[PDB]
């Protein structure tokens, strides 16, 4: 349908004290590819990121309306946003459009600013927030991204085991998607620091 | 999606499952359903997930001030009229299927709200995709004013039948007891499925990932 | 179907467009100018539906001229593309949808040359080279082979002609005359109009 | 009017080991949102060295299997021998084409051992195109099964790691857990598991429990 | 396909120890009208097997005339063989499948029960050709209503007697009458056993209407 | 329709029908041809003219193609059927193959008709 | 869905069934389709159950106001025109059809069919998807000057006859006898449904 | 799907991708699209996979029945015409098949094309598939009939690798087959991505 | 279009109206919809008038042959299955619906509805576009063991009730009493139609 | 859309056709031969649906070769056109309709040159000049001005080039190369292939 125009994939897995999010770099129109540098992950502020997929028109449009509400929320508050608070914000933005709804599946991942706690969540076209204790993925290949993270995920994983798990889940699942590929950007959100890496992937 | 409730002598219990699915796959296994309205009044959604979510949000919000403005107990029949007028305003555009039950000054009462807005009073029913499995179980074994323990054993088996008899119904069973003395929440009261284990483990050694670019930003 | 092409050199941006404007079975205007000047170093290439091509691009033309006169300085290439996308995205859900395909060519005193790809759905992506129309399939593949960030404009114009001569071989529509211009630190420089006697 | 087809769900897996070939599928038969029964084995044994899976519209899965079994006897009576795994695959290709105008709606997966004792996995499509591969999948969860077998079985996308040919002990545990993970996220998979392992000595069946949800 | 009218209702069947019970309502339905209140929806095949169906009853009488003569032709042959309950279930699978390729499918849903040589058989076919074997079966909304009722009993008690079976049928016949608007009060409970098929006459069930006083 | 077996076996296996057909061939007019180096020459002798019969319709030398000609001896009625049907198939071969027709191709396209129509039912 | 009302000397008898089924499945098998608009003024719900319950409250909102302003029970003709104008004006978005009946101190018991947007007075009125099949009994078996006991049986026999033939009708028979001294509410259990020819 | 062939002094070179996808999911990456008809005769595939596998084997059947009959080693021209006529009788029934026939004969290394509607063409350079237009660009640039054996491999290699990069339905490993007078021979099989790393550097 | 048949001890009474209207205009207001298939075997025409008259002749063609071969009147069950198989097989191009009734020396008077392609035996059967509204009278007023005089009135009262409510039914009532001694044909003029409640 | 043109001179018939065969957005074969030889002095020009163009014209090609070999002499130009119309009219009501546009060019030893126009509906009309395709609108008008029965082929070829150069100006599709031949008493004579070194 319309969600299959630009394709795309977004993956977020929860570790022990840290959380990792990953999405591919590909941007294309149906059978026509465009560019390799496309970015599906935008910063929400410290230790909080959001993934986006589906029609890229709404990907870039909702990202501006989320940054519309993000900055206004951060300027009014004296404290940073919690990842659980942002989940409900995306639910209101998608529900007010209920007649005209946007086409996208936002994926929110980050750490609880309280102390170390990781938090993950994802929504749907209808704007239904959902909290899972393992991982969240979205895209046209999301049926493929399940089986990788279903078996590989563990209750507690250090940044060493977390990055190795989410990276292998991306490289294996995205290669079976025709509209997805061309590099994978992986972000590691830890308590002390934040690590960004670009994986070596096939061009196909 | 299997949701049901039963009214017994001393109160009412609303059962629901923990599993939510999106059309090809299970979205969340432990996902909660029953929402909060009043201390003695609870509801549970069905049909469209976000529509049933946002409708109970506007219902719990409207009923919250009704409890704050009146300072008294809330009527269960007041909740149902709020829900259907929203469905009437949109002419059935909202696919929210809602069941409402609780205990008020009059006594334990259970209602039903169809996404088209029709409301019906009734001692017991079920809604969702697996409603026909729970209705048949509740129809045969129901008795007027059953003991609290007798109603607990029956409704848990009703949700169990609604789960085993539906593809969209699974996970644990969340039952919430509401009595004239007070309401109590039971999380994951029933777990009919034992096999929570797996036969192998997957671990990765450091250095097995083909990393190309690497950078570190301190915080 | 009209054709567009552009190439981002290290200090330069090389763009080209077809000058043919046709209707029904005939070509009415073969010298038609598809190139619109947004700013001094910023050009624009607009093709699409015959009615939406001229109308919607003239809206962008003055809207960019609005910014430059109000603040005394023109939009940057990055700022220009992002404002044109929201203009196209706002009319997407209106009763007058605009079918257009735009390439933004511009040069900045700091980030240097910039080339931007835009579809009719208002999806903006930066690319070293891009093309529109059905002829984009017969051309961009050649750019995949011969493109390097260090290429000199002298060889780029020669490789641009090699791509456009493919439009006279495989590509069905005639398109006799092409217009070619370049953008650099010294401003807009016109190039010899491609002519096939 | 009349809908000639309906999606009955299910999942079928086949993997070709060095000396062995493993084929497994679930027992769940469901149409729409309702369960017909929790035991409906899709795996059908053609010969001792060949096992065919069927995933798709159930009415075509029953008839097409009876047509194949009818042509198995035509061969053996004529040629005085059993069909090879590669001969059965190329046969059904022409069988599926005979309907090319009104194609059978099914996803067929054939697996077993060839004359060399090596596993041969054959994945089909309703129009009859086929290929040989080490491991294939099919059904509603087909998108789920493929990435897991690419990393684990295929050793793909892994740098500087020892590549050991597939072992039967691991191949069993890999097929079990991918379905345990499938039964989690697949509404059409679960309730039981039947694993048919074809080796040089013979076929050995197994039964594995799964969640009832 | 075109327009059949002559609509039917739900049919239930289940397995118990040494026999099979299959019950169905006697009401034929035309559109929203309940027209023919006396109809035999359960047909006997030889001694050891029995048949019932749903959907178009006009197509069911045609399946009476086809399958009936074919079964009688075997009794006329006298070779010492009888159609097995799997054979009737198999023949109806292909007979209903043969109507889809000619673009003239018959609207019906059939259930084949039987007991032979200590083997209790219950089976299901469909216009769409879906066929399988299950210990408890139902058609229409019975698969939504009466099916999970029997699954809960078969999981707790896989072995059921002849009395326990009929008691569960009446309780399922009681529930189906409640929640199925197109169902009807009068029904026939037919049971096949080691003595053969025995079809009971018109029956009813005591209904509990106390919900009327509990709602008000 | 008329359906029967015409040509049947004898005690010796010989076919009286085919043998009598070859006797009519022997009673035909004398025709000859010889392969040269780059050339071929066909000839036939027709003595029947008292100045009455026209010489345009008598010709027994026929061309199947630009590169293929032929001459016949036998019943003049049966030749007109074979020559026409050979030319229809010879040009139908140029429809299937852009290259011209090799003489051996068409000779199989001809002798095969004498095979079928001899053993065919009622022919 | 079957609703029935019969006028007699001392009042009217307005019956209804308890079955409410959306589609082919029963939502509730016990439901009261008689929604009081006043003490002696009642409304028999039919057609779309969602639109009928909305009009019943919008009608009660206007009738309670008209009743309190006059400080006297409104006439049955007053309550009928309220439903009609709400029906006729809003028939675009409202497919519901109602039957207004009650008792007043002027003409006594009255029954006004509001179905389809028109208004007419009748001695006996029937509505719903099941009222089409009962035309035979209500026409021939109707006699002038029937006692209140005969009117209860005449109304019950026709409703019980609809419940047999109508697939969307069933449950228990609700009877409301509206007279000058008050209103009597009775419920007929499934065992008390009058038995007719069973073949 | 990207398939291309061209003829020059040293004979025909056929290059194709390995990937065939259904919808958004890739069915198989390792699919071998090139059909083997005769030792010296080489076919291709385009469009529907089953339509090619069915009809190209009928062409291989006709080519073998021909060589068993007259022993003349059927020319590429006769093979291309017989394949087109078989698609004409069923025209309009929904059969979609593209293909290209390559081989050498007494005339030379002929190159022909057969469409789904029966279009039969002849020329120096052909390509088909969803990525055919992406192939025409690189192939035409820097091509002459006088190209050598080694120089033409670099043209055929860069043809698939750069064309499959811009196509979502084209990919897998590059399968390139040179044609000679004795017969075609397998040259190299190499992943597109592995060659992408050499071109970027 | 209304057809009716009622079985009793000595035979059956098969009634019909005379009104035949294609669309909203009456083609003929006096027409006999009872077409004899035999002496005691009759067929009540309903549904499409063009398809019913074609089947009536195709049925009579087969029944006369079956009757002459046996040299005895065919059973009523024989004549019913002729119409049914012609109906069920040809229902693609034939929308007509017929009601077969007659008398035989075996079981006596019989009435077999052939409508929609099925076959069933009934003590009384009604068909046509007007038979849907008379279900109330025929169900409640039916009593076992009615005299031939009561059966003529019971059949007439229900047909005259359909003629009032059915817009496509009217004209004069045709009655045929089929007994063992013969068949009596009577016509009820518009003045002799039984008067019912007029208000 | 493919293009055809023909001109009937006093002793000659001058015809021309586009050599381009294209599919989708690309031109696959630019040298393609649209000219089919029916007889010695009789040519044929067939354009239309890509599938019906080659298939149906080859049927006419051999059917004319059927007549010439059976009777020893070819059809006349008038006899050829009238037999081709019946062939196209018979398949008009069949399940395989043929969309084609044909020009028949031939010379007779008595009536002289003959040019015949035929549509996809098999309507045969004799005309001194005719053309097919969308380019027929941009060309035939020029012939209306410059045509005379006494024109010499030397000026006709020059005027033919003037008409075909209009296809490179107003007419949208490229069509780089055109094939031109002439028919006269001396048989088929090829002319310089029109080439545009763009």
Tokens of C41: 């170093």
CA A197, CA A185: separation in Å to the nearest integer?
Answer: 6
C-alpha to C-alpha distances, H169 to C137, C160, H20, H94, nearest whole angstrom: 14, 27, 7, 22
d(CA C92, CA C99): 9
Spatial distance between the Cα atoms of G132 and I129, rounded to a whole number of angstroms? 12
| Other CB atoms within 10 Å distance of the CB of residue D187 | 23
Q: Which helix (H) or strand (E) holds D176?
A: helix D168-185
Tokens of C115: 């080339």
In units of Å, what resolution does this entry have?
A: 4.2
Cα–Cα distances in angstroms (integers) from residue C29 to residues C3, C18, C99, F47, I82, in the given order: 15, 11, 21, 79, 78
First to last CA, chain G: 24
Pair I4, I173: CB distance under 8 Å? no
Of D146, D130, D118, give the one whose Cα is nearest residue D19. D118
DSSP B145-176: T--HHHHHHHHHHHHHHHHHT-SS--S-EEEE
| E132-137 contacts, C-beta under 8 A, 24 or more apart | E132/D29, E132/D36, E132/D37, E132/D40, E132/D58, E133/D37, E133/E89, E134/D36, E134/D37, E135/E14, E135/E15, E136/E13, E136/E14, E136/E15, E137/E12, E137/E13, E137/E14, E137/E111
User: How far apart are the C-alpha atoms of G151 and H36, rounded to whole Å?
Assistant: 92
Alpha helix ranges (H) inside chain A: 56-76, 83-95, 142-152, 159-174
Structure tokens at J169: 């100006």
Helix (H) or strand (E) holding D107: strand D106-113
Query: Per the CB < 8 Å rule, is D131 touching H28?
Result: yes
In a 13 Å sphere around the CA of D165, the CA atoms on its Cβ side amount to 7
To which H or E segment does residue A110 belong? strand A107-111
Q: Which of C80, C120, C87, C140 is nearest to C104 (CA)?
A: C80
**What is the C-alpha separation between H168 and H177, in angstroms, rounded?**
23
E strand intervals along H17-148: 20-22, 25-28, 35-36, 41-43, 46-47, 97-104, 109-114, 120-122, 125-129
Buried b (16+ CB within 10 A) or exposed e, J30-62: bebebbbebbebbbbbbbbbbbbbbbbbbebbe
Greatest Cα-to-Cα distance within chain B, rounded to the nearest angstrom: 70
Count of other CB atoms within 10 angstroms of residue F13: 6
**In the numeric block, which tokens belong to residue I61?**
């063609």
Instruction: Compute CA distances C128 → C83, C105, H133, H164, whole Å.
Output: 20, 11, 21, 19
CB contact under 8 A, D36 and E133: no
Q: What distances in angstroms separate CA J47 from CA A2, D134, G112, H85, H147, one per listed residue? A: 40, 50, 77, 18, 36
User: Cβ distance H136 to H166 under 8 Å?
Assistant: no
Torsion of the alpha carbons at J151, J153, J158 and J162, rounded to the nearest 10: 70
Quote the CA–CA distance of E118 and J144 in Å, as a whole number: 97
In this structure, chain H runs to a length of 201
- Placement of tokens 């591919």 in the chain: A24
Tally Cβ neighbours within 10 Å of residue C62.
10
Q: Which of B204, B189, B199 is nearest to B16 (CA)?
A: B189
> Where does residue D34 rank: exposed (0-12), middle (13-18), buried (19+ CB within 10 A)?
middle
Domain count for chain H, please give it: 1
Which of E146, E174, E181 is best to mutate for the G interface (most G CBs within 10 A)? Answer: E181
**Region at B107 (left for phi over 0; alpha for psi -120 to 50; beta for the rest):** left
Kindly provide the residue ranges of all beta strands, DSSP E only, lying in chain E, ordered along the sequence. 11-16, 19-25, 29-30, 33-34, 42-45, 49-55, 108-116, 119-124, 132-133, 136-138, 187-193, 196-199
Measured distance CA(C135)–CA(A66) in Å, rounded: 38
CA E175 to chain B, closest CA, distance in angstroms equals 6
Alpha-carbon distance of C26 to G90, in angstroms, equals 56
Q: Taking a C-beta distance cutoff of 8 angstroms, is the pair D55, D139 a contact?
A: yes
Smallest Cβ–Cβ distance between B123 and the set E141, E152, E214 belongs to E214
- Residue A195 has a CB neighbour count (10 Å cut-off) of 17
Which of F63, F84, F91 is nearest residue J62 as measured by Cβ atoms? F91
Domain ranges of chain J: 1-197
Residue E206, class by beta-carbon neighbours within 10 Å (0-12 exposed, 13-18 middle, 19+ buried)?
exposed
Identify whether the C-beta of residue F3 lies closer than 8 Å to the C-beta of residue F121. yes
| Strands ordered across the beta sheet of G11-16 | G124-127, G3-7, G11-16, G173-179, G183-188
The number of folded domains in chain B is 1
Distance CA E131, CA D37 (A): 11
| Residues with Cβ within 8 Å of residue C166, at least 6 apart in sequence | C138, C139, C142, H136, H137, H140, H141
- Helices E57-77 and E85-101, packing angle to 10 deg: 130
User: Regarding beta strands J178-184 and J187-190, do their DSSP bridges make them parallel or antiparallel, or are they unpaired?
Assistant: antiparallel
The gap between the terminal CA atoms of chain I, to the nearest Å, is 24
Cα gap I159→I173, rounded to integer Å: 7
Distance in Å, alpha carbon of A104 to nearest chain H alpha carbon: 17
Q: Count Cα atoms within 13 angstroms, Cβ side, for G197.
A: 16
CA distance I11 to D43: 64
Do G and E make contact, counting contact as 3+ CB pairs within 8 angstroms?
yes
Q: What method did the depositors use to determine the structure?
A: cryo-EM
Residues on chain H touching F100 (C-beta within 8 angstroms):
none
Whether residue H121 lies within 8 A of chain C, CB to CB, comes out as: no
J26 and H115 in contact by Cβ < 8 A?
Answer: no
Query: How many whole angstroms from its chain centre is CA F40?
Result: 18
- Residue F107's SS3 state is helix
| Distance, CA of H19 to CA of A31 (rounded, Å) | 14
- HSE at residue B43, side-chain half, CA atoms within 13 A, is 30
Name which of A30, A34, A204 to mutate to probe chain H: the one with the most chain H Cβ atoms within 10 A of its Cβ: A204
**Cα separation values, H99 from F95, H36, H60, H129, Å:** 21, 13, 13, 9
Q: Of D100, D180, D197, D104, whose CA–CA distance to D145 is shortest?
A: D180
Which chain D residue has the Cα nearest residue H49?
D129
> Three-class SS string for G41-99?
CEEEEECCHHHHHHHHHHHHHHHHHHHHHHCCCCCHHHHHHHHHHHHHHHCCCCCCEEE
Measure C136 CA to nearest chain J CA, in Å.
11
In this complex, which of J25, J171, J197 lies closest to C171 when CB atoms are compared?
J25
Verify whether the Cβ–Cβ distance C137 to H140 is below 8 Å.
no
Token duo for residue J190: 């090829």
The order of strands in the sheet holding I34-36 is: I34-36, I42-46, I97-104, I108-113, I120-121
Q: Do the Cβ atoms of H141 and C166 come within 8 Å? A: yes
* Of residues J125, J156, J136, the one with CA closest to residue J7: J156
Measured CA to CA, the distance from residue J117 to residue J104 in angstroms comes to: 7
Yes or no, beta carbons of F84 and J65 under 8 Å apart: no
SS3 assignment, position A143: helix
Element (H, E) at C48: strand C43-48
E171 and B162 in contact by Cβ < 8 A?
no
Q: Which helix (H) or strand (E) holds A187?
A: strand A184-189
Instruction: Please indicate whether chains D and I are in contact, defined as at least 3 beta carbon pairs under 8 Å.
Output: no
Domain span holding position A120: 1-204
Print the domain residue range for H167.
1-201
CB E33 within 8 A of CB I139: no
Breaks following residues of chain D (C-to-N distance > 2.5 Å): none
SS (H, E, C) C30-45: CCCCCEEECCCCCEEE
Half-sphere exposure of J191 (CA within 13 A, CB side): 21
Cα distances (Å, whole numbers) of residue G111 to G91, G117, H87: 21, 15, 76
CB contact under 8 A, E58 and I120: no
> Using H for helix, E for strand and C for coil, what is the string for D33-89?
CEEEECCCCCCEECCCCEEEEEEECHHHHHHHHHHHHHHHHHHHHHHCCCCCHHHHH
Rounded distance between C-alpha atoms, residue I132 and residue I195, angstroms: 20
Q: J71 to each of A43, E63, F87, J41, J66, how far by Cα in Å?
A: 88, 66, 12, 17, 9
CB atoms under 10 Å from CB of A46, counted, come to: 13
Nearest CA in chain G to I138: G136
Residue in chain B closest to A137 (alpha carbons) equals B27
H81 touching J (Cβ < 8 Å): no
E113 forms bridges with which residues in the sheet? E50, E122
Q: Which residues in chain E are closer than 8 Å to D37, comparing Cβ atoms?
A: 132-134
- Whether C141 and H140 lie within 8 Å, measured CB to CB: no
From the list I112, I120, I119, the residue with the least C-alpha distance to I76 is: I112
Which ranges constitute the DSSP H helices of D80-126?
85-97
Contact C115, C130 (CB under 8 A): yes
Structural contact between residues D184 and B170, judged by C-beta atoms closer than 8 angstroms: no
Taking CB atoms and an 8 Å limit, are A33 and H192 in contact across chains? no
State the chains in contact with C (3 or more Cβ–Cβ pairs under 8 Å): A, H, J
- Interchain contact, B164 vs E214, CB within 8 Å: no
Stated length of chain F: 123
Interface of D with B (CB under 8 A): 30, 33-35, 140, 157-161, 173-174, 176-177, 180, 184-188, 209-213
Measured in angstroms, the CA of G57 and the nearest CA of chain I are apart by 33
What are the residues of chain J with a beta carbon less than 8 Å away from any beta carbon of chain C? 22, 25-27, 30, 134-135, 137-138, 168-174, 176, 196-198
Residue E85 in 3-state DSSP?
helix
Q: Which of these, E127, E123, E120, E178, lies nearest to E149 by C-alpha position?
A: E178
Q: Does an H or E element contain I70, and which?
A: helix I49-70
Paired residues of J61 in beta bridges? none
Task: Tell me the C-alpha distance between I19 and I30, whole Å.
Answer: 6
Q: What angle do CA A68, A69, A70 make, to 5 degrees?
A: 95
Distance of CA I179 to CAs D108, I11, I38, Å?
67, 5, 13
| Side-chain half-sphere exposure of E98, counting CA atoms within 13 A | 6
Distance of CA D147 to the CA centre of its chain: 17
Asked whether the beta carbons of C164 and C194 are under 8 A apart, the reply is: yes
- Please indicate if any CB of chain G lies within 8 Å of the CB of E182: yes
| Cβ-contact A40, A53 below 8 angstroms | yes
How many residues are recorded in chain D?
213
Task: Classify residue B83 by its DSSP letter.
Answer: H
The full DSSP string for chain G is: --EEEEE-SSEEEEEE---EEETTEEEESS---EEESSSS-EEEEES-HHHHHHHHHHHHHHHHHHHHHHTSPPPHHHHHHHHHHHHHHHTTT---EEEEEEEETTTEEEEEE-GGG--EE-SEEEESTTTTS-HHHHHHS--SS--HHHHHHHHHHHHHHHHHHBTT--S-EEEEEEESS-EEEEEE-GGGSPP----
From the list A6, A34, A57, the residue facing C117 with the nearest CB is: A34
Query: Of F83, B198, I116, G150, which Cα lies nearest the Cα of J70?
Result: F83
- Quote the CA–CA distance of J177 and F43 in Å, as a whole number: 49
SS3 label, residue E66? helix
Q: What are phi and psi of A62, to 5 degrees?
A: -65, -35
* Cβ-defined contact of C125 to A35 (cutoff 8 Å): yes
Q: Which residues are CB-contacts of I144 (< 8 A; sequence separation ≥ 6)?
A: none
Q: d(Cα D99, Cα A5) in Å, to the nearest integer?
A: 32
Q: Nearest C-alpha of chain A: how many angstroms from D162? A: 16
For residue G114, give Cα distances in angstroms to F6, F23, G87.
Answer: 92, 106, 8
What are the φ and ψ backbone dihedral angles of J115, each rounded to 5 degrees? -125, 135
Half-sphere exposure of J188 (CA within 13 A, CB side): 17
Q: How far is B206 from chain D (nearest CA, A)?
A: 11
The number of angstroms, rounded, from the C-alpha of J136 to the middle of its chain's C-alpha atoms is 12
Taking phi first (over 0 means left), then psi (-120 to 50 degrees means alpha), and beta for anything else, what does residue H56 get? alpha
Q: Report the half-sphere exposure of A114 (CA within 13 A, side-chain side).
A: 8
Total CB pairs under 8 A between chain F and H? 18
> Is J69–F91 a contact, with Cβ atoms under 8 angstroms apart?
yes
Cα distance between the two ends of chain H: 27
- Name every residue whose Cβ is closer than 8 Å to that of residue H66 and which is 6 or more positions away in sequence: H72, H74, H78
Task: Kindly report the nearest CA distance between residue C61 and chain H, in angstroms.
Answer: 32
How many CB atoms lie under 10 A from the CB of residue I68? 10
Interface test mutation site (partner B, options A16, A126, A139, A182, max chain B beta carbons within 10 A): A126
Cβ–Cβ < 8 Å for H12, H43: no
Q: Rounded to a whole number, what is the distance in Å from the CA of E212 to chain B's nearest CA?
A: 9
In Å, how far are C108, D78, J5, J10, J103 from J148, measured between CA atoms?
A: 66, 78, 17, 9, 20
Residue B119 in contact with partner chain G when CB distance is under 8 A: yes
Q: Do residue F97 and residue H81 have CB atoms under 8 angstroms apart?
A: yes
- Which H, E and C letters describe I106-138, residue by residue? CCEEEEEECHHHCCEECCEEEECCCCCCCHHHH
Query: B-D interface: how many C-beta pairs under 8 angstroms?
Result: 57
What CA–CA distances, in Å, run from D142 to B21, D109, D139, H97?
18, 12, 5, 27
């Amino acid at each position: 349908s319309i969600m299959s125009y630009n394709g795309g994939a977004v993956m977020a897995m929860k570790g022990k004290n840290c959380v990792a999010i990953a999405a591919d770099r590909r941007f294309g129109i149906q059978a026509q590819m465009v560019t390799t540098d496309f970015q599906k992950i935008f910063p929400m502020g410290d230790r909080l990121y959001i993934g986006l997929a589906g029609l890229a028109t709404d990907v870039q449009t909702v990202a501006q309306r989320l940054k519309f509400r993000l900055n206004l929320y951060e300027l009014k508050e004296g404290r940073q946003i919690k990842p659980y608070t942002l989940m409900s914000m995306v639910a209101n933005l998608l529900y007010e459009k209920r007649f005209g709804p946007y086409y996208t599946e936002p994926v929110i991942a980050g750490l609880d600013p309280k102390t170390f706690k990781p938090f993950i969540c994802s929504l749907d076209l209808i704007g239904c927030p959902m909290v899972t204790d393992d991982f969240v993925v979205s895209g046209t290949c999301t049926e493929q991204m399940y089986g990788m993270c279903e078996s590989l995920w563990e209750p507690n994983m250090d940044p060493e085991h977390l990055f190795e798990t989410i990276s292998q889940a991306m490289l294996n699942a995205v290669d079976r998607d025709a509209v997805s590929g061309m590099g994978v950007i992986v972000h590691i959100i830890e308590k002390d620091k934040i690590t960004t890496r670009t994986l070596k992937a096939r061009m196909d | 999606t299997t949701i049901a409730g039963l009214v017994f002598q001393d109160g009412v219990i609303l059962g629901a499952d923990t599993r939510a699915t999106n059309d090809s796959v299970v979205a969340d296994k432990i996902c909660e359903k029953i929402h909060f309205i009043a201390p003695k009044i609870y509801c549970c959604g069905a049909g469209v997930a976000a529509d049933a979510e946002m409708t109970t949000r506007m219902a719990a919000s409207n009923m919250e001030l009704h409890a704050l403005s009146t300072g008294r107990e809330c009527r269960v029949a007041t909740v149902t009229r709020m829900l259907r007028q929203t469905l009437f305003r949109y002419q059935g555009y909202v696919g929210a299927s809602l069941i409402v039950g609780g205990v008020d000054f009059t006594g334990p009462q259970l209602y039903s709200v169809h996404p088209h807005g029709s409301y019906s009073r009734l001692p017991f029913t079920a809604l969702g995709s697996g409603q026909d499995a729970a209705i048949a179980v509740l129809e045969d074994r129901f008795q007027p004013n059953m003991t609290l323990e007798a109603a607990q054993e029956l409704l848990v088996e009703a949700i169990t039948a609604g789960i085993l008899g539906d593809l969209g119904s699974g996970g644990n069973v969340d039952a919430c007891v509401i009595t004239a003395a007070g309401a109590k929440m039971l999380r994951a009261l029933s777990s009919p499925t034992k096999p929570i284990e797996r036969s192998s483990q997957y671990r990765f050694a450091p250095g097995t990932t083909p990393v190309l670019s690497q950078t570190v930003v301190p915080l | 179907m009209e054709y567009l092409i552009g190439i981002q050199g290290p200090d330069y941006v090389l763009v080209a467009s077809d000058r043919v404007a046709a209707s029904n079975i005939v070509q009415m205007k073969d010298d038609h100018d598809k190139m619109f000047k947004m700013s001094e170093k910023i050009l624009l290439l607009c093709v699409g539906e015959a009615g939406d091509t001229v109308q919607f691009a003239e809206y962008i033309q003055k809207n960019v001229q609005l910014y430059k006169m109000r603040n005394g300085y023109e939009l940057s290439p990055t700022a220009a593309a992002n404002f044109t996308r929201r203009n196209l995205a706002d009319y997407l859900r209106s009763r007058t949808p605009y079918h257009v395909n735009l390439l933004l060519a511009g040069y900045d005193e700091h980030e240097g040359p910039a080339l931007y790809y835009m579809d009719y759905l208002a999806a903006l992506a930066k690319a070293p080279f891009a093309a529109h129309g059905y002829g984009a399939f017969l051309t961009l593949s050649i750019l995949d082979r011969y493109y390097t960030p260090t290429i000199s404009r002298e060889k780029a114009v020669e490789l641009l002609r090699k791509c456009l001569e493919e439009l006279q071989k495989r590509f069905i529509l005639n398109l006799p005359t092409f217009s070619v211009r370049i953008i650099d630190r010294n401003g807009i420089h016109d190039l010899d109009n491609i002519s096939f006697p | 009017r009349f809908s000639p087809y309906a999606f009955n769900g299910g999942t079928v897996l086949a993997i070709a080991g060095e000396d062995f070939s493993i084929v497994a599928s679930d027992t769940r038969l469901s149409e729409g949102f309702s369960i017909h029964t929790r035991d409906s084995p899709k795996c059908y044994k053609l010969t001792d060295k060949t096992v065919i899976g069927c995933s798709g519209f159930h009415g075509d899965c029953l008839t097409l299997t009876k047509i194949i079994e009818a042509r198995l006897k035509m061969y053996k009576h004529s040629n005085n021998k059993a069909m090879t795994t590669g001969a059965i695959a190329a046969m059904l290709s022409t069988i599926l084409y005979s309907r090319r105008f009104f194609p059978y709606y099914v996803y067929n997966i054939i697996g077993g051992l060839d004359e060399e004792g090596k596993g041969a996995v054959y994945s089909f499509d309703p129009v009859g195109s086929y290929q040989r591969d080490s491991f294939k999948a099919g059904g509603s969860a087909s998108a789920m099964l493929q990435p897991l077998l690419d990393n684990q079985v295929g050793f793909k996308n892994m740098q500087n790691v020892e590549h050991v040919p597939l072992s039967l002990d691991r191949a069993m545990r890999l097929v079990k857990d991918v379905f345990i993970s499938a039964a989690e996220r697949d509404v059409y998979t679960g309730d039981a598991l039947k694993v048919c392992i074809v080796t040089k000595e013979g076929i050995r069946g197994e039964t594995v429990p799964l969640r009832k949800d | 396909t075109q327009n059949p009218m002559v609509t039917g209702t739900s049919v239930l069947g289940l397995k118990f120890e040494g026999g099979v019970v299959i019950a169905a309502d006697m009401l034929g339905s035309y559109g929203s009208l309940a027209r023919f209140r006396n109809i035999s929806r359960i047909m006997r095949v030889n001694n050891s097997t029995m048949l019932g169906a749903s959907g178009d009853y006009a197509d069911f009488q045609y399946l009476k005339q086809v399958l009936g003569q074919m079964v009688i032709d075997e009794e006329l042959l006298g070779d010492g063989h009888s159609y097995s309950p799997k054979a009737i279930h198999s023949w109806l699978t292909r007979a209903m499948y043969s109507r889809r390729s000619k673009m003239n499918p018959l609207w019906n849903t059939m259930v084949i029960g039987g007991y032979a040589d200590g083997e209790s058989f219950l089976g299901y076919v469909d216009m769409l050709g879906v066929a399988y074997e299950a210990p408890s079966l139902a058609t229409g909304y019975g698969a939504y209503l009466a099916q999970p009722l029997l699954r809960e009993v078969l999981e707790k008690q896989p072995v059921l007697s002849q009395t326990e079976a009929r008691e569960l049928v009446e309780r399922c016949m009681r529930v189906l009458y409640y929640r199925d608007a197109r169902s009807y009060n009068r029904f026939q409970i037919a049971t096949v056993t080691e003595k053969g098929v025995e079809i009971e006459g018109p029956l009813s069930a005591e209904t509990n209407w106390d919900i009327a006083h509990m709602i008000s | 329709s008329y359906d029967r077996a015409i040509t049947v076996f004898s005690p010796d296996g010989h076919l009286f029908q085919v043998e009598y057909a070859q006797e009519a061939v022997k009673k035909g007019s004398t025709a000859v041809g010889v392969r040269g180096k780059d050339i071929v020459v066909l000839g036939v002798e027709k003595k029947s003219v008292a100045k009455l019969q026209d010489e345009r319709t008598v010709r027994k030398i026929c061309a199947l193609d630009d590169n293929v000609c032929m001459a016949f001896a036998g019943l003049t009625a049966d030749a007109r059927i074979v020559i026409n049907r050979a030319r229809v198939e010879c040009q139908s071969h140029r429809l299937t193959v852009e290259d011209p027709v090799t003489v051996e191709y068409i000779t199989r396209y001809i002798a095969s008709l004498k095979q079928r129509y001899t053993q065919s039912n009622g022919r | 869905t079957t609703i029935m009302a019969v006028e007699f000397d001392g009042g009217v008898v307005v019956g209804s069934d308890s079955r409410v089924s959306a589609g082919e499945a029963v939502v509730n098998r016990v439901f009261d389709k008689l929604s009081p608009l006043h003490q002696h003024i009642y409304c028999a719900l039919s057609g779309s159950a969602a639109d009928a319950q909305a009009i019943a409250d919008m009608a009660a909102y206007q009738l309670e106001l008209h009743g309190m302003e006059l400080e006297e029970p409104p006439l049955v003709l007053a309550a009928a025109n309220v439903v009609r104008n709400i029906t006729y004006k809003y028939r675009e978005d409202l497919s519901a059809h109602l039957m207004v009946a009650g008792w007043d101190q002027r003409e006594g018991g009255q029954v006004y069919g509001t179905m389809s947007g028109m208004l007419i007075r009748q001695p006996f009125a029937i509505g719903g998807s099941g009222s089409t099949y009962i035309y035979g009994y209500v026409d021939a078996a109707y006699k002038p000057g029937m006692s209140p006991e005969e009117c209860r049986r005449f109304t019950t026999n026709a409703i019980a006859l609809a419940m047999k033939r109508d697939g969307s009708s069933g449950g228990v028979i609700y009877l409301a006898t509206i007279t000058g001294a008050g209103v009597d509410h009775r419920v007929i259990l499934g065992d008390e449904l009058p038995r007719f020819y069973d073949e | 799907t990207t398939t291309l062939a061209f003829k020059f002094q040293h004979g025909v070179i056929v290059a194709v991708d390995s990937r065939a996808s259904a919808g958004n999911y890739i069915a198989t990456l390792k699919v071998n699209k090139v059909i083997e008809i005769n030792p010296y005769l080489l076919g291709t595939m385009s469009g529907c996979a089953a339509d090619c596998l069915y009809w190209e084997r009928l062409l291989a059947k006709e080519c073998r029945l021909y060589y068993l009959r007259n022993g003349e080693r059927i020319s590429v021209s006769a093979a291309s015409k017989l394949l087109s006529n078989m698609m004409c009788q069923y025209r309009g029934m929904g059969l979609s098949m593209g293909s290209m026939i390559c081989g050498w004969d007494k005339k030379g290394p002929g190159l022909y094309y057969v469409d789904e509607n029966g279009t039969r063409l002849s020329g120096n350079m052909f390509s088909t598939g969803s990525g055919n237009s992406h192939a025409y660009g690189v192939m035409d640039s820097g091509y002459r009939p006088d190209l050598s054996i080694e120089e033409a491999y670099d043209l055929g290699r860069r043809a698939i690798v750069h064309a499959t990069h811009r196509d979502s339905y084209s990919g897998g490993v590059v399968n390139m087959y040179h044609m000679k007078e004795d017969g075609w021979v397998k040259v190299e099989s190499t992943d597109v991505s592995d060659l992408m790393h050499q071109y970027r550097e």
